[PDB]
Amino acid sequence: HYRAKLELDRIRSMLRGRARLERKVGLKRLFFLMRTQTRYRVEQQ
Amino acid sequence: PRILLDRSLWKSLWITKLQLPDINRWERVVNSRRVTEDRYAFVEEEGVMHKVNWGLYCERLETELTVTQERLPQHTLLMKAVPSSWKKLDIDISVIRGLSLREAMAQCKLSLRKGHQIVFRALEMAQQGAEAKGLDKEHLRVAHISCYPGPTDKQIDIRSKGYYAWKTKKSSHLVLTLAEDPEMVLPDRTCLPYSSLMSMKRAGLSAQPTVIDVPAITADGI
Amino acid sequence: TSLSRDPQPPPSD
Amino acid sequence: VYGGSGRGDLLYENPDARRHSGRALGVLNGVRHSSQATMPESGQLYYRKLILHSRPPNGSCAGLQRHCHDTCNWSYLIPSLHRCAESAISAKLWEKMCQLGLEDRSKAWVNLTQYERQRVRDGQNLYRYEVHQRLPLLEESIGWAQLDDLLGWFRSARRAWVRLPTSSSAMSCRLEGHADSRDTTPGRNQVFDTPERVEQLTEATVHRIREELQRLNRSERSDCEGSAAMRASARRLARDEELSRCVEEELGWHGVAL
Amino acid sequence: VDREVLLTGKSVWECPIHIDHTCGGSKTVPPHAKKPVRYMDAGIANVGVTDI
Amino acid sequence: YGRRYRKMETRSKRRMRPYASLGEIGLENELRKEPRINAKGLNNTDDEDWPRHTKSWGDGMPSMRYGS
Amino acid sequence: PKRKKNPMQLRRKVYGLHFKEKYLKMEEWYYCPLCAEPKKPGEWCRREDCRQIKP
Amino acid sequence: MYARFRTRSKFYFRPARPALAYNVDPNVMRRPKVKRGLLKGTYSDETVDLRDRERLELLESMRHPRERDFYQDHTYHNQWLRRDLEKHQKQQLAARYKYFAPDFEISPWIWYPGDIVEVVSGEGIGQRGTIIAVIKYKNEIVVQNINVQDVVIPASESRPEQIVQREHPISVTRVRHVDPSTNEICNIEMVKVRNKETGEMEEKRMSLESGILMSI
Amino acid sequence: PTLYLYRFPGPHGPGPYTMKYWWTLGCFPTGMEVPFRLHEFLSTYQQEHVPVEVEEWLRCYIKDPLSELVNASNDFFKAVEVYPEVESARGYKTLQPSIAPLLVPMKKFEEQLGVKISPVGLRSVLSNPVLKDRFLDDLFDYKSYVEKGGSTPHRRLARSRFEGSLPAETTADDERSLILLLTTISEGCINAGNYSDAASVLADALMFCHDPDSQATTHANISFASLLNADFKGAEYNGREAALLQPQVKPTSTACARGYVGWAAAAAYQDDFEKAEAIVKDGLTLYVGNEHLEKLANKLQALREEQPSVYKQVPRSLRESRSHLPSQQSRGLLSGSGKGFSNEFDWVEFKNKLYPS
Amino acid sequence: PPVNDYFGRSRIWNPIACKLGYVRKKADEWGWPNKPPPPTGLRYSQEFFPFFFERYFPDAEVRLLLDSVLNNETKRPVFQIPCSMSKVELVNYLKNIYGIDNVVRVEVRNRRGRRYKNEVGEIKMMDDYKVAVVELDTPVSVELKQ
RNA sequence: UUAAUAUUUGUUUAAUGAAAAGUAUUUUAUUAUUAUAUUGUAUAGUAUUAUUAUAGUGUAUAGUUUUUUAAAAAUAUAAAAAUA
Ligand SMILES: [Mg+2]
Ligand SMILES: [Zn+2]
């Protein structure tokens, strides 16, 4: 499994609160955000 | 290794005194020999990178920063191992930031919080230090007060009928900066309530203070 | 309030 | 340029290179778009602005609510150069050099060791570098300078053993390098004619010393005329005599004559 | 004694304290103990080279 | 059941019924010094009711709950 | 069902009036006309002067 | 009326600083060497540490009287069982006292007071001096007017604080003798030689280049 | 099979709750931690240890006090001359340059002379242009005098010890310049607003003068400084010592008149208006014409015109109660008993009341 | 390990005899194993070297407490002796060596050796000593010229 | 994070419906006296007392297993009745 960690680490500053303080929560949030944005851009935008 | 440089590692950990005999000396391998040149640092001059003596450059940077921090007109005190939790200490600190020294010490003396007592002690020490450095007393104002978590102790204790309880004694530090501000105006705190005014009137004391014209100091007799 | 005093002569040879 | 090194900072930090870090850059502070991760496009002005302005204030940045040190003052810049000269050349080596020069007129250098020669050369180099750094602040503060520090401007050069140019001597030539490759990017204060700017700064400070001396003399004469009596203080007389002799000797050492 | 020599300058030759490098272990070995002879040691020190 | 050990201990150790009048405290002082017929009996020293202000050490020493 | 609370839920308490009026609040004080000390109106000093007349 | 209070995120998340591998800070040879906090901004005129013995009364006064500690005069476990020290202080001891190791003294000893010795490395490189003192059990040499520093003497009941320049012991590894005739650096070795007026054999010091015996 | 550790140092380091045990009990309250104090031993005993012969020979190589005074005065004058002048802006008060390089030469001068000088006072006299000129002139005069004719206080101490082992002339020029510059520093300190420090400086400044006029002037200045510092007892003492020195003072000096003024003002602050009026009456009968006495007499009469209308007199049990000048307010702000923090109810003071000392 | 690490008031003497103890005893007695062993007669006789040396060159550490007799006329001076001595041993010691014949009574009381820690925290205990309180007919005192 | 939390809150006090000891530790100090080897010392705390080696001319100022304070609710006390 290739979790996009080293790439999504650099975007943690866009988040706020605990997602920006801790690492794994912010990585999960960014992963979900990018996945849903790609899905929306492909099938609904 | 064919050539073991004195700063390299081989079955050993990095010991400063063992791996760096002289910090201003840089060791290289030239013609299968250990050549010990002077250490240089690159600085930007006239659009090119010139090499300056690294030890002199570092000493110069340190000395300049130190003398600037010295001749900056303020007094900074760093108290360590304050016997209070950092949370409660910051809660008590949040009321003093941006106050005159007079009002700060007044509020600390009139408050009922351990953090307030500790920062009163800190203000007293910082005022003594500022006086020793040569700053005036009336124009002093707190500029930056903060606390960060410090040491910690863990204490277990037995209770009635044999139950163990854990406790975490915390400690914090305090950075307190007193600055000189000539443009400060202090509110008139000498006002008295009408009750006290008329009570002193009934007593016979003067509600208004007696100002006596005191002559100046003259060295004419010498 | 006493000033810094003068050092003493050599006690021995 | 905001966080790393200011205008008169002796430090040299490449603002885009993290050479003062003990950890790989994990989080990027100034981020505008999600596409700033795999290709931050740093180096562009409109993004390095965000990054360097989101960077926190350092010891030399002197954050807003914190006090800011007086650096543009000539009375502080001169003792800076003097303390740098003292850090470069020790008192013993300085006395040895002064004696050797006054005895042989720069002809008996064989008595000095190679280590001392290298110390002198490194001191001259560091003095030239710090003068190149302080040149804008010096040209800013030349207006409201004081006579003591205007004379210290030559005192420090004499101590560092650097003869100032006038239209040994180390401020005469520029650092070699082709102009097509030399750094010329804007925003970085870097003078390109150091022997041409320091020389005119020396001329201006000589004129300023003359003006300050004439102002002192005129103020003393006006005070004497207002008092209607020739009653000068011994301290002021001795100060005037010693300062006149000192400025004369220390300008004759460099080669400038009033 | 370090402070004293720093303040005086007298040259000290022997250590002022007797160092028992065994930490009380040398008293556990019998008194008549002696290392046996080991013939043909697998070492290079006996050659006594001075150039490598 | 929820009964606090310390509070129940104090309640069971010392009395709670308050006096009602000064005549009643006088009657109680009269009826207190009475011998036990078949009970255990307690020591009735000749200074049990006399002022202990000079006897006990702590009756004059500085106190915080009484403020000097 | 209890769970860790994000920093935002930890800062909701300072929005209420109970937190502000308890910890962070200044005093109304003046100088005791007989002791030259900071004094709140209503509470006096032990000295004989401050007991007879209320400063 | 109400002071502005901003909750800090460090009190909610504060991880441990990254540790060093093999005590190798990856940027020792690249960054300049300055005091801690000067480049960052941390500066303080005076540091009043409450954990010092001089501030014990203040530390006890600042705490609340309700706080209690029960082992002021007696300990729970017996404190007369010999137990080991801590790792950091054992390492401090091993770093300060190195001459306690067996065979720490250099053999054979060649450096005796009266010789002219040139400093080859370290501070004072290229300077010749006379050996003033020889600390054999520490393998140190006190050379004349070389590595002199200011030693201080605290004020007594009758004298004030007195600071004076004094030479400090120099290690033997960074010093080399000077030939009396050649006036250059020369390797010196121990040599057993019989005396002409005494049949006994004494140990002198001979140079390889010139072949000159040195008495003790 | 478990072990009990009452209070042990945490993971980051030992805190104050354990350092208290370390300093009182001698070791941590667990006993598992071995007491290790090699660092403080090295810092204290190894440093203070000195051999007997070296300790006895130390007193032979102490520096020459005359040369030390000369060099310290030279360096201090150089420093105060290099110190720049404050540039006055318009609209806002310019921050005076902090005296960073001036503390060391001034400290050496203080430890060589036996007197303490205020850094605030030095900063104020350097900010004041005319006071700076007076200070520079007096310091140059003192330098020339100590370089030409030695140190008069040191010679006086030497003669005192000599006559003790086996009179006092007038003050010399060096001591005159010294008391002059000390009075200048005290005036600058008063302008800055440190009356206690000014009085403490003048208290030692009076020791260098031996002529009656200089002593009367110093007594008047100390009376004024103590009056501004609210130390009415010392103010009155010095004010009346001025009038005691009056019979031996020159007719042109008004230091005794200023001492009368200070004494009368100290009495007025002590609320003995009758005594103050008697003192100012005596002062006027002595010097019929003097503004310092006349203004104070007018003020006392203006107060006495209203004194009998409120209570017919000032009370007896209410004297020295009303705090008038802000100096005692500023001092009580620091020396006052806190609310629940430090007072007669706190135990750290209750035990001090209970125990003898 | 069989090494007793307690240096407190209740330190116990190990009764178990080790082989090394006998070896060391024999080696110090007659240089085992180089020299031949002396015969049983000389071994068990009064002429055996340890007993001969203990009888002709006795070794007893008697220390006087300075506080008990310094600047005070005391009738009960105290001394410190090894634990192997007794009242009769001490009185004979003082009578024959120092000449103190008038000894009324000696009060014996054992005492554990002084224990202390050095700067590094090592527990080093001084040797054990027996306290004796000798009584004389006349009070004695040694004045300290101040 | 739970946590501005839960349980605790003890410096002579309202002194106690009460008071005579043994044993094992911890800690040790120049006690006096009878005045003949050795051996273990005193007070103070701590833990324990069925299973007989502690009870009589008459019992230690004995108060840490005894604990602070300017509210309602919850809870405890039916020895909290002048109810049922
Ligand atoms: Mg599409
Ligand atoms: Zn008051």
Nearest chain D residue (CA) to A21: D27
What burial class does residue I86 get, using C-beta atoms within 10 Å of its C-beta: 0-12 exposed, 13-18 middle, 19+ buried? Answer: middle
> Which of helix, strand or coil describes residue B143?
strand
**Residue D165 DSSP code:** P
Where is the binding site for Zn(2+), in residues of G? Answer: 32, 35, 45, 50
From the CA of A39, the nearest ligand is 1
Q: Which residues contact D113 (CB under 8 A, 6 or more apart)?
A: H126
Separation CA I259–CA I223 (nearest Å):
7
Is the CB of F54 within 7 Å of strand K?
no
| CA of residue H76 to C1' of nucleotide K6, angstroms | 29
Is the CB of J35 within 7 Å of strand K?
no
Q: Which two tokens stand for residue I178?
A: 């010294």
> Can you name the residues that pair with I7 across neighbouring β-strands?
B155
> Which of helix, strand or coil describes residue I84?
coil
I97 touches chain D (CB under 8 A): yes
Nearest chain E residue (CA) to I58: E7
Q: What separation, in Å, do the N-terminal and C-terminal C-alpha atoms of chain E show? A: 40
Separation CA I98–CA B74 (nearest Å):
9
Q: Which residues of H touch A21 (CB under 8 A)?
A: 9, 12-13
Q: Which residues contact J34 (CB under 8 A, 6 or more apart)?
A: E32
- Counting Cα atoms < 13 Å in the Cβ hemisphere of E41 gives 8
Query: How many contacts, defined by CB atoms under 8 Å, are there between A and H?
Result: 6
Inter-chain CB proximity B77 and H44 less than 8 Å = yes
> Is the Cβ–Cβ distance between I254 and I287 less than 8 Å?
yes
Which residue type sits at I106? M
> Is the Cβ–Cβ distance between I120 and B136 less than 8 Å?
yes
Pick from B61, B170, B166, B165: which is nearest to B115 by CA? Answer: B170
Pick from B26, B29, B27, B25: which is nearest to B2 by CA? Answer: B29
> Is the Cβ–Cβ distance between H165 and H196 less than 8 Å?
no
Which residue type sits at B104? A
* Residues at Cβ < 5 Å from ligand 2 ion: G 32, 34-35, 45, 50, 55
Pick from J5, J11, J12, J2: which is nearest to J123 by CA? Answer: J5
Is the CB of F23 within 7 Å of strand K?
no
Q: Which two tokens stand for residue D174?
A: 């520029």
Separation CA I130–CA I138 (nearest Å):
12
DSSP helix, strand, coil percent of chain A (3-state; round to 5): 70, 0, 30
Pairing of strands B149-158, B74-82: unpaired
Q: Which two tokens stand for residue D144?
A: 């409201």
Maximum distance among all alpha carbons in chain E?
A: 52
Pairing of strands I7-9, J115-117: unpaired
Separation CA I100–CA B68 (nearest Å):
10
Where is the binding site, in residues of G? Answer: 32, 35, 45, 50
Inter-chain CB proximity J8 and H85 less than 8 Å = no
H191 touches chain E (CB under 8 A): no
Q: Which residues of G touch I336 (CB under 8 A)?
A: 35, 37-38
> Can you name the residues that pair with H185 across neighbouring β-strands?
H178
Which of H:92-121 have CB within 8 Å of E? 99-102, 113
Angle between the N-to-C axes of helices I103-113 and I65-82, in degrees from 0 to 180, rounded to the nearest 10: 150
**Which of C3, C10, C11 comes nearest I65 by C-beta?**
C3
Buried b (16+ CB within 10 A) or exposed e, I277-309: bebbeebbeeeeebebbbebbebbeebeeebee
**Residue H178 DSSP code:** B
Q: Which two tokens stand for residue D137?
A: 């602040």
User: Is A in contact with J (3 or more beta carbon pairs below 8 Å)?
Assistant: no
Taking the centre of ligand 1 as the mean of its atom positions, its distance from the CA of residue I222, in whole angstroms, is 91
What is the sign, positive or negative, of the torsion defined by CA atoms of D121, D123, D128, D132?
Answer: positive
Give one DSSP letter per residue of D117-164, joined into a string.
HHHHHHHHHHHHHHHHHHHHHHHHHTTT--HHHHHHHHHHHHHTT-PP
> Which of helix, strand or coil describes residue I251?
coil
**Which of I82, I97, I140 comes nearest D234 by C-beta?**
I140
Q: Which residues of D touch I140 (CB under 8 A)?
A: 234-235, 238
Separation CA I292–CA D226 (nearest Å):
30
Q: Which residues contact I36 (CB under 8 A, 6 or more apart)?
A: H85, H86, H89, J119, J120, J121
Q: Which residues contact D211 (CB under 8 A, 6 or more apart)?
A: none
Q: Which two tokens stand for residue B82?
A: 């304050």
Pairing of strands H128-135, J129-135: unpaired
Maximum distance among all alpha carbons in chain B?
A: 102
Pick from B169, B90, H125: which is nearest to I16 by CA? Answer: B169
Query: How many contacts, defined by CB atoms under 8 Å, are there between B and I?
Result: 189
Give one DSSP letter per residue of B1-56, joined into a string.
--S--TTS-SSS---HHHH-S-TTEEEEESSSSEEEEE-EEEEEETTEEEEEEHHH
Q: Measure H53 CA to nearest chain E CA, in Å.
A: 25
My answer on whether omega of the bond before B193 falls inside 30° of 0, hence cis, is: no
Separation CA B180–CA I251 (nearest Å):
46
Separation CA G27–CA B108 (nearest Å):
10
Nearest chain A residue (CA) to D35: A11
From the CA of A44, the nearest ligand is 1
Q: Which two tokens stand for residue D114?
A: 């190679």
DSSP helix, strand, coil percent of chain H (3-state; round to 5): 10, 25, 65
Give φ, ψ of B220 to 5 degrees. -70, -30
Torsion of CA I32, I33, I34, I40, to 10 degrees: -160
> Is the Cβ–Cβ distance between A15 and A22 less than 8 Å?
no
Separation CA I313–CA I21 (nearest Å):
60
Element containing residue B169 per DSSP (H, E): strand B164-180
J124 touches chain I (CB under 8 A): no
User: Is J in contact with D (3 or more beta carbon pairs below 8 Å)?
Assistant: no
Q: Which residues contact E42 (CB under 8 A, 6 or more apart)?
A: none
From the CA of I336, the nearest ligand is 2
**Residue G15 DSSP code:** G
**Which of H1, H3, H7 comes nearest G10 by C-beta?**
H7
Q: Which two tokens stand for residue B57?
A: 């450059």
Pairing of strands J105-111, J129-135: antiparallel
- Counting Cα atoms < 13 Å in the Cβ hemisphere of B102 gives 22
Separation CA D78–CA H82 (nearest Å):
62
**Residue C5 DSSP code:** P
Give φ, ψ of H82 to 5 degrees. -65, 115
Element containing residue I259 per DSSP (H, E): helix I255-269
- Kindly report the number of other CB atoms within 10 A of residue I158's CB atom: 14
> Which of helix, strand or coil describes residue I8?
strand
- Tokens 């441990």 locate to H16
> Which of helix, strand or coil describes residue F55?
coil
Taking the centre of ligand 2 as the mean of its atom positions, its distance from the CA of residue G47, in whole angstroms, is 7
CA angle J50, J55, J61 (to 5 degrees): 95
Which residue type sits at F26? G
> Which of helix, strand or coil describes residue H138?
coil
Q: What separation, in Å, do the N-terminal and C-terminal C-alpha atoms of chain C show? A: 34
> Is the Cβ–Cβ distance between I261 and I235 less than 8 Å?
no
Inter-chain CB proximity E30 and J20 less than 8 Å = yes
> Which of helix, strand or coil describes residue J70?
strand
Q: Which two tokens stand for residue G3?
A: 């769970």
J3: Cα separation from own chain's centroid = 24
Dihedral class, residue F45 (left if φ above 0, else alpha if ψ from -120 to 50, else beta): beta
Element containing residue J108 per DSSP (H, E): strand J105-111
Taking the centre of ligand 1 as the mean of its atom positions, its distance from the CA of residue A37, in whole angstroms, is 12
What burial class does residue I239 get, using C-beta atoms within 10 Å of its C-beta: 0-12 exposed, 13-18 middle, 19+ buried? Answer: buried
Q: How far is CA H59 from CA B110, B122, D173, H182, H210, in A?
A: 20, 12, 63, 67, 70
| CA of residue B160 to C1' of nucleotide K45, angstroms | 20
Contacts 24+ apart (CB under 8 A), G9-15: G10/H7, G10/H12, G11/H7, G14/H5, G14/H7
Q: Which residues of J touch E32 (CB under 8 A)?
A: 27, 32-34
Separation CA D1–CA D95 (nearest Å):
41
Is the CB of J88 within 7 Å of strand K?
yes
Nucleotide closest to G3 measured between CA and C1' = K1
Q: Which residues contact H84 (CB under 8 A, 6 or more apart)?
A: H90, I34
Q: Which two tokens stand for residue D85?
A: 């000269």
From the CA of G32, the nearest ligand is 2
Pick from B102, B186, B104: which is nearest to B145 by CA? Answer: B104
| CA of residue H33 to C1' of nucleotide K50, angstroms | 79
Separation CA F5–CA F11 (nearest Å):
10
What is the sign, positive or negative, of the torsion defined by CA atoms of D27, D29, D30, D31?
Answer: positive
Q: Which two tokens stand for residue H215?
A: 């008495």
Q: Considering just the CA atoms, what is the radius of gyration of chain G in Å?
A: 21
Inter-chain CB proximity G34 and I322 less than 8 Å = yes
My answer on whether omega of the bond before J33 falls inside 30° of 0, hence cis, is: yes
In H84-209, the DSSP E strands lie at 116-119, 128-135, 140-143, 148-153, 162-167, 170-171, 175-177, 188-194, 201-207
Give φ, ψ of D156 to 5 degrees. -65, -40
Separation CA H120–CA H172 (nearest Å):
11
Q: Measure G7 CA to nearest chain B CA, in Å.
A: 14
Torsion of CA D114, D117, D119, D123, to 10 degrees: -160
Contacts 24+ apart (CB under 8 A), B102-109: B102/B138, B102/B186, B102/B189, B102/I333, B104/B142, B105/I333, B105/I334, B106/G27, B106/G29, B106/G38, B106/I333, B107/G26, B107/G27, B108/I338, B109/G38, B109/I336, B109/I338, B109/I339, B109/I341
Q: Which two tokens stand for residue I265?
A: 């003002």
Separation CA I260–CA I295 (nearest Å):
13
Q: Which residues contact H23 (CB under 8 A, 6 or more apart)?
A: B13, B14, B15
Q: Which two tokens stand for residue I129?
A: 């242009």
Question: Which residue, counting CA atoms, is nearest to the C1' of nucleotide K28?
Answer: J9
Pairing of strands B74-82, H46-49: parallel
> Is the Cβ–Cβ distance between I195 and I224 less than 8 Å?
no
Inter-chain CB proximity J32 and E32 less than 8 Å = yes
Nucleotide closest to F1 measured between CA and C1' = K76
Q: Which two tokens stand for residue A13?
A: 């500053």
Q: How far is CA E24 from CA B50, E19, E29, H132, I156, in A?
A: 62, 10, 10, 37, 66
> Is the Cβ–Cβ distance between I253 and I216 less than 8 Å?
yes
Q: Which two tokens stand for residue C4?
A: 């810094």
Give one DSSP letter per residue of I161-211, joined into a string.
HHHHH-------HHHHHHHHHHHHHHHHHHHHT-HHHHHHHHHHHTTT--S
Chain K positions under 7 Å from a protein CB?
1-2, 4, 7-19, 25-41, 59, 61-63, 65-69, 75-77, 80
- Kindly report the number of other CB atoms within 10 A of residue D247's CB atom: 20
- Tokens 């303040």 locate to E7
Pairing of strands B74-82, B140-146: unpaired
Torsion of CA A24, A25, A27, A31, to 10 degrees: 140
Q: Which two tokens stand for residue G6?
A: 């994000």
Q: Which two tokens stand for residue B41?
A: 């640092």
Question: Which residue, counting CA atoms, is nearest to the C1' of nucleotide K30?
Answer: J68
What is the sign, positive or negative, of the torsion defined by CA atoms of H165, H168, H174, H179?
Answer: positive
- Tokens 């520029």 locate to D174
Q: What separation, in Å, do the N-terminal and C-terminal C-alpha atoms of chain G show? A: 58
> Is the Cβ–Cβ distance between D151 and B64 less than 8 Å?
no
Which residue type sits at I59? R
Q: Which residues contact B32 (CB under 8 A, 6 or more apart)?
A: B3
Technique used to solve these coordinates: cryo-EM
> Is the Cβ–Cβ distance between I120 and I189 less than 8 Å?
yes
Is the CB of F29 within 7 Å of strand K?
no
Q: Which residues contact B160 (CB under 8 A, 6 or more apart)?
A: F5
Q: How far is CA I215 from CA G20, I134, I200, I255, I256, in A?
A: 60, 20, 16, 9, 10
DSSP helix, strand, coil percent of chain C (3-state; round to 5): 0, 0, 100
Give φ, ψ of B160 to 5 degrees. -60, 135
Q: How many residues does chain B have?
A: 222
